Structures are given as structure tokens and as C-alpha cells.
Amino acid sequence: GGSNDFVYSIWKGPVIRAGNFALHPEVVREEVKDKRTLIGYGRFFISNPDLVDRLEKGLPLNKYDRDTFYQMSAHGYIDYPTYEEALKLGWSSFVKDFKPQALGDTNLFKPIKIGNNELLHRAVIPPLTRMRALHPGNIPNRDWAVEYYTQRAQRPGTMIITEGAFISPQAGGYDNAPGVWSEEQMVEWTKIFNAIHEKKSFVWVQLWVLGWAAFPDNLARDGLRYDSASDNVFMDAEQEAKAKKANNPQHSLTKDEIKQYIKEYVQAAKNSIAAGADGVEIHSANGYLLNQFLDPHSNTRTDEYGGSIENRARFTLEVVDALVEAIGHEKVGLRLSPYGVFNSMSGGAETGIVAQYAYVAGELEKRAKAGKRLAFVHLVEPR
Ligand SMILES: Cc1cc2nc3c(=O)[nH]c(=O)nc-3n(C[C@H](O)[C@H](O)[C@H](O)COP(=O)(O)O)c2cc1C
Numbered sequence: 500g501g502s503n504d505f506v507y508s509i510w511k512g513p514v515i516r517a518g519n520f521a522l523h524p525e526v527v528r529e530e531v532k533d534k535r536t537l538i539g540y541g542r543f544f545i546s547n548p549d550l551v552d553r554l555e556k557g558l559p560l561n562k563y564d565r566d567t568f569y570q571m572s573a574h575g576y577i578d579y580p581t582y583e584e585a586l587k588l589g590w591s592s593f594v595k596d597f598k599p600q601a602l603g604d605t606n607l608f609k610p611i612k613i614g615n616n617e618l619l620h621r622a623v624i625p626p627l628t629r630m631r632a633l634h635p636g637n638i639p640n641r642d643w644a645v646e647y648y649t650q651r652a653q654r655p656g657t658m659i660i661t662e663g664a665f666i667s668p669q670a671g672g673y674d675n676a677p678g679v680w681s682e683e684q685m686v687e688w689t690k691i692f693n694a695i696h697e698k699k700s701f702v703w704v705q706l707w708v709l710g711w712a713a714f715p716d717n718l719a720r721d722g723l724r725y726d727s728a729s730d731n732v733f734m735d736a737e738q739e740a741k742a743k744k745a746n747n748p749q750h751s752l753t754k755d756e757i758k759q760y761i762k763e764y765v766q767a768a769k770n771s772i773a774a775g776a777d778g779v780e781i782h783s784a785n786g787y788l789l790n791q792f793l794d795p796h797s798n799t800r801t802d803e804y805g806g807s808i809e810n811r812a813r814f815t816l817e818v819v820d821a822l823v824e825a826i827g828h829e830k831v832g833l834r835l836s837p838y839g840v841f842n843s844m845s846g847g848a849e850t851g852i853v854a855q856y857a858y859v860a861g862e863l864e865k866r867a868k869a870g871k872r873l874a875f876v877h878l879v880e881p882r
Contacts, residue, residue: 501838501847501881509860510876513613517625518880524600531606539625548650549581551622557601559593569630577646614778614829614874616701619656626660626705630675637678639687645694652700663707666767669723672713679767685774692775701777706767710788712842719747726750728791728798734843764818765825778830783815786842796845808858828871838881
């Protein structure tokens with residue numbers, strides 16, 4: 500009882516759908532009929548570095564392991580084999596009861612242009628947190644990350660959206676998540692961007708700000724604030740306990756701090772493109788700071804950044820405008836999850852959510868008509 504099709508009735512640019520598309524090619528085949536729709540594959544791009552070639556010819560794919568997702572290891576990260584490599588290792592099988600289809604005839608493999616990049620296929624690599632960044636310093640993995648991103652840039656002209664990169668330590672909270680603010684991170688990021696560029700593929704950076712999803716103890720350790728939209732609403736009992744235990748209560752953002760966050764967004768974007776990135780994506784989904792401001796359950800502010808649909812979307816659009824005026828509208832994308840209830844979001848329960856995100860896409864399209872259209876709009880499917 501939910502759909503993201505309304506965005507198509509409002510936003511007239513490229514739309515990147517993501518979620519539960521790997522094991523359902525009969526759905527993708529219907530969804531690619533729309534000429535401006537791209538498909539992202541999450542888990543099976545971790546499980547298969549050559550997933551694109553397996554989607555073109557209808558090859559069987561490999562099983563993904565749930566335990567190797569957020570674990571620090573080379574295992575289940577860069578050890579996944581190609582099709583031929585999976586054949587040379589014998590079998591005693593791959594996936595279970597599954598019927599693959601060849602989408603090489605569909606619209607998935609006809610070229611399209613997003614931003615300054617010329618995609619030869621419409622298979623997108625969504626942002627994926629692997630939790631393998633070096634701590635401390637939030638440095639991307641020097642031993643594995645380069646190889647990891649290089650393996651999935653196998654198909655020429657493959658759009659890659661990197662994992663959530665903290666625009667600032669203040670936007671941090673995860674010790675195993677890579678950053679973008681410091682030069683030490685920018686060296687490794689430059690190496691990765693080059694490694695992807697040499698394979699004739701493209702790389703996009705997801706700008707990440709945890710919000711209330713951050714770990715209060717990790718922030719109190721570095722003398723940072725545990726902040727959100729409102730200070731009277733919390734995630735859960737654990738996040739509530741960790742805040743008072745570590746003597747770091749949930750902080751309500753003021754104007755100055757918001758402007759600071761925006762400045763950090765701009766600096767993060769310019770630093771990203773200085774390292775050789777194709778563009779940046781604003782993560783306003785999955786119950787993080789921007790999404791926290793968007794969602795009425797998390798946003799109870801009475802000031803300029805809350806109280807209404809126009810006010811709750813002011814932050815996201817502020818970041819959008821800032822980045823557009825910074826690096827250009829062709830290097831800026833947006834990530835949204837209307838029906839996502841992750842990190843204590845409303846989702847389908849709130850009857851006004853569709854109106855909120857319709858307002859978002861509306862403002863976006865209005866800016867698009869003005870001559871400044873974003874490269875794409877990333878959507879997370881209901882599940
Ligand atoms: C291990 C893992 C990490 C993820 N990390 C992020 C993330 O950092 N940022 C984001 O926007 N989405 C993230 N996602 C969500 C993906 O963008 C995508 O929606 C998800 O993989 C579901 O796609 P699928 O069911 O087709 O595999 C993550 C998903 C997984 C499984």
C-alpha cells in the first residue's frame with residue numbers, strides 16, 4: 500500500500516530506484532520501460548563485482564553474507580569471485596531456487612547521461628556502508644577499499660555511489676566510517692577515485708550526517724555534540740540511555756550550527772571534486788539528520804526549520820541550493836526515502852509523508868525549470 504510513482508508526476512529528471520530489484524527482474528523489466536529510470540542493486544553488488552554482466556546475459560548470482568557487511572575484514576569484501584572465477588572454484592551451489600533473466604535487450608543497458616558522466620548502462624551502484632574505514636582518523640581502508648571499488652568498476656561506464664562519508668567530525672558518530680573533511684582522507688579518496696576513473700567508470704560521493712543515529716559515547720569521546728531536529732523526541736531506549744550515561748544529551752540544532760553544517764557540506768563537496776570525484780549525493784534518507792528534519796515525528800521545532808511541510812524541508816533544500824551554487828547542479832544528487840521507517844521514521848504511518856516528499860520534488864523541479872536541475876533523484880523503495 501505505497502509507491503514512489505508520484506515523484507514521476509512531479510520530478511521530470513533522472514530517477515534512481517533502489518531496493519529488492521535483484522531477485523525480481525520481472526519487476527525491473529516493467530520499471531525500465533520509463534526512459535528516465537535507473538536501477539540500483541545493493542546487496543548483490545557486494546556479493547557480485549560482475550553483477551552487471553550477470554544481469555545482461557541472465558547469469559546466476561552469488562549468495563551474500565549478512566555477517567560480513569559491517570565487519571572489518573578482507574573476507575566478504577574483496578574475495579568475492581567473478582563468474583569465470585566462480586567457475587574455476589568449482590560449484591555445492593550458488594543461490595537457491597532462482598530463475599535469472601537476460602535484461603541486455605531491455606532499457607537497462609542502453610546509454611544515458613547523468614550530470615557530467617556518460618553512462619553506457621543504467622545499472623547503478625548504491626551507497627553501501629562496509630564499516631572498514633581505518634580508526635582513528637576516519638581514513639578509508641588502505642589495504643582493501645581500492646581493490647574493492649576497482650572490482651565493481653569492472654563494466655565500462657559504471658555509475659558508482661560511494662558509502663556515506665562524514666562531511667565533518669560533528670557529522671560523525673561511527674568510528675569505522677570514512678570521512679571527507681581532512682586531507683589524510685582525501686589522499687586515499689583520490690587514490691580510489693583514480694582507480695575507478697582508470698576503469699572508465701564514474702564515482703559519486705554520498706555526503707553523510709548521522710544526526711541522532713550517531714553513537715553519543717563516540718561523540719562525547721571527541722568532545723562533539725549529539726544532535727537532532729528536536730530534543731524531546733529520541734530514537735529508542737538504547738539511544739536514550741547512551742545519551743544520559745555518557746553525559747551527552749540530545750541537542751537541538753540552532754541556526755548557527757545549521758549554517759555550520761551547510762558550510763561543512765560545501766567544503767565536503769569541493770574537497771570531493773578536488774580529489775577527482777564526478778559529483779556528490781546529499782543523503783537525506785534513512786532517518787539521518789536531514790531526514791530527521793523532514794520527518795514530523797522527529798521534527799517538532801516551532802521555529803523556521805519546523806512546524807510545517809515548507810519548514811521541515813528547508814534544511815534539505817538549503818543544502819541543495821548551497822551545493823548547487825558551489826560545485827554546480829550537474830554534480831549534485833539527492834537521496835530520499837519516503838516510505839522508510841529505519842532509524843525511527845514515520846513512513847506509511849504518517850498520512851502527510853507523501854505530501855512532504857511531493858513538496859520536496861516540487862521545489863526541486865521548480866529549481867530545475869529555473870535552469871538549475873539536479874543530476875538525479877535517488878529513491879528508496881518501500882519494503
Ligand atoms: C550493508 C548495507 C549498507 C548500506 N549503506 C547505505 C548507506 O550508507 N547510505 C545509503 O543511503 N544507503 C545504504 N544502504 C541501502 C542501499 O542503498 C540499498 O537501498 C539497499 O542495499 C537495498 O537494496 P537491495 O535490496 O536491492 O539490495 C545500505 C544497504 C546495505 C545492505
